[PDB]
Amino acid sequence: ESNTAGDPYTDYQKASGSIDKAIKLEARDPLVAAYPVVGVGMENLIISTNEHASSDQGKTVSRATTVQDSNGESWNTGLSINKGESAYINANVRYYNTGTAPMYKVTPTTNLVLDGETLATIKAQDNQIGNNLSPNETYPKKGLSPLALNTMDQFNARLIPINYDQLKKLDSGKQIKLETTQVSGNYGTKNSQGQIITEGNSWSNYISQIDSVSASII
């Protein structure tokens, strides 16, 4: 086998250290797989209740003759709400890497769950993608604030809605959980000229192949 561990790198490339210099040194043993383990952790959640509040005032003057005069005032206040689009959800998340390899262009998919049902399944679009994620690191980095998971659209234009029942049970003891279902990223290889290419190199092509030829240790 050219790739004993089942990873994108051959036995010679691993043993000779001729790979991405961000790979942990243990993963340059032909028996240990270069393998990123990325997870997402929510830090808090923000609810934007989209009700339409209204208010208006008024004044009236009138004069009648058969002499009679009148003057009056008025003020009204209203509140409207859509029951299928009752609020918007914003989760602040952060990616961790506890593997042996860096992942490029990290794109996690996450379920948002509330009381035994998945409200949304979001895949990270442009605003939420992390360019680099080295092992034993996070995105965003340690001294920075977490991301904002605002949108469910492919183009980052549609906010994440919840209806009226979920909104009512959300203003109670119930909490929203976040769970990562999968993460897609890239690995680096050098092409003809010594340039690192991380675009046609999908990690998911190897996940199910590394998980079937190896034992797991944590």
Q: How far apart are CA 119 and CA 163, in angstroms?
A: 10
Given a copy of itself, Ca ion, none, residue 11, with its beta carbon under 5 to 8 Å by kind, binds Ca ion
211 annotated ligand-binding residue = no
Contact positions with a copy of itself (CB under 8 A) in 54-93 = 54-93
Determine if 172 is a binding residue for a copy of itself (CB under 8 A).
Answer: no
Question: What's the closest the beta carbon of residue 17 comes to Ca ion, in angstroms?
Answer: 14
The token pair at 123 is 């895949």
Question: What's the closest the beta carbon of residue 34 comes to Ca ion, in angstroms?
Answer: 15
Question: What's the closest the beta carbon of residue 183 comes to a copy of itself, in angstroms?
Answer: 4
Contact yes or no for 60/78 (Cβ under 8 A): no
Determine if 115 is a binding residue for a copy of itself (CB under 8 A).
Answer: no
Out of 11, 85, 115, 137, the only residue in the binding site for Ca ion (CB under 5 A) is 11
Question: What's the closest the beta carbon of residue 173 comes to a copy of itself, in angstroms?
Answer: 14
SS3 24: coil
Could you tell me how many residues make up the chain? 218
Out of 131, 142, 172, 173, the only residue in the binding site for a copy of itself (CB under 8 A) is 131
Q: How far apart are CA 139 and CA 41, in angstroms?
A: 11
Determine if 14 is a binding residue for a copy of itself (CB under 8 A).
Answer: no
126 annotated ligand-binding residue = no
Using the CB atoms, write b or e for 53-81: b if 16+ within 10 Å: eeeeeeeeeeeeeeeeeeeeeeeeeeeee
